[PDB]
Amino acid sequence: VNSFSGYLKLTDNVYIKNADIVEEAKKVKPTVVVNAANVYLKHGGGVAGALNKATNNAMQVESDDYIATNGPLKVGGSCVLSGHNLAKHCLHVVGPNVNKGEDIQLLKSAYENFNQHEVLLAPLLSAGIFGADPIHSLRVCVDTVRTNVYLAVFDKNLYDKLVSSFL
């Protein structure tokens, strides 16, 4: 039993909700919140920009030190950093950005990072400003993640479509 509330159960381990991931994290304080990161961990907009804003830019400061030490992530890769005031940890995961011409096949590799954590709060990878079809992203999530994932979809209209179209 966990403290996630109001989710629709899609499969044995994948749940979904129309919610602002920032407000969800602040309420639940999960062990792991997933960020929709880029390889440079520059958290300018979308999910990443909103989460970073909620940390008062502490996420960005920590991220800049991580990049200065380690260099950029790989598309499809991840790193674990602090969750600051939002969660114990933040798993920064890089899904492909279609608006950069990045291979959509790397979306499965991106979701594989979730399997290293027993329970996560997360957005749909490569959705929103990353330019991929959120319906496709949900399919890859369900077919790749085996651990318990609580998915937050900010747009109410998109949420209804993901549910109604969910096979």
Ligand X SMILES: OC[C@H]1CCCCN1c1ncnc2[nH]ccc12
The reply to whether 154 sits near ligand X by the rule CB under 6 A is yes
The reply to whether 127 sits near ligand X by the rule CB under 6 A is yes
Backbone phi, then psi, for 80, in 5-degree steps?
A: -100, 125
The reply to whether 48 sits near ligand X by the rule CB under 6 A is no
Q: Which is nearer to ligand X, 1 or 4 (CB)?
A: 4
The reply to whether 47 sits near ligand X by the rule CB under 6 A is yes
Q: Which of 5, 20, 61, 133 binds ligand X (CB under 6 A)?
A: 20
Extract the tokens encoding 14. Answer: 């994948």
Backbone phi, then psi, for 10, in 5-degree steps?
A: -90, -40
Q: Which of 41, 75, 121, 124 binds ligand X (CB under 6 A)?
A: 124
The reply to whether 59 sits near ligand X by the rule CB under 6 A is no
Q: Which of 86, 93, 106, 152 binds ligand X (CB under 6 A)?
A: 152
The reply to whether 125 sits near ligand X by the rule CB under 6 A is no
Measured between alpha carbons, how far is residue 136 from residues 152, 160, 162 in Å? 15, 15, 9
Strand residues in 6-162 grouped as ranges (E)? 8-9, 14-18, 32-36, 78-82, 89-93, 119-122, 148-153
The reply to whether 111 sits near ligand X by the rule CB under 6 A is no
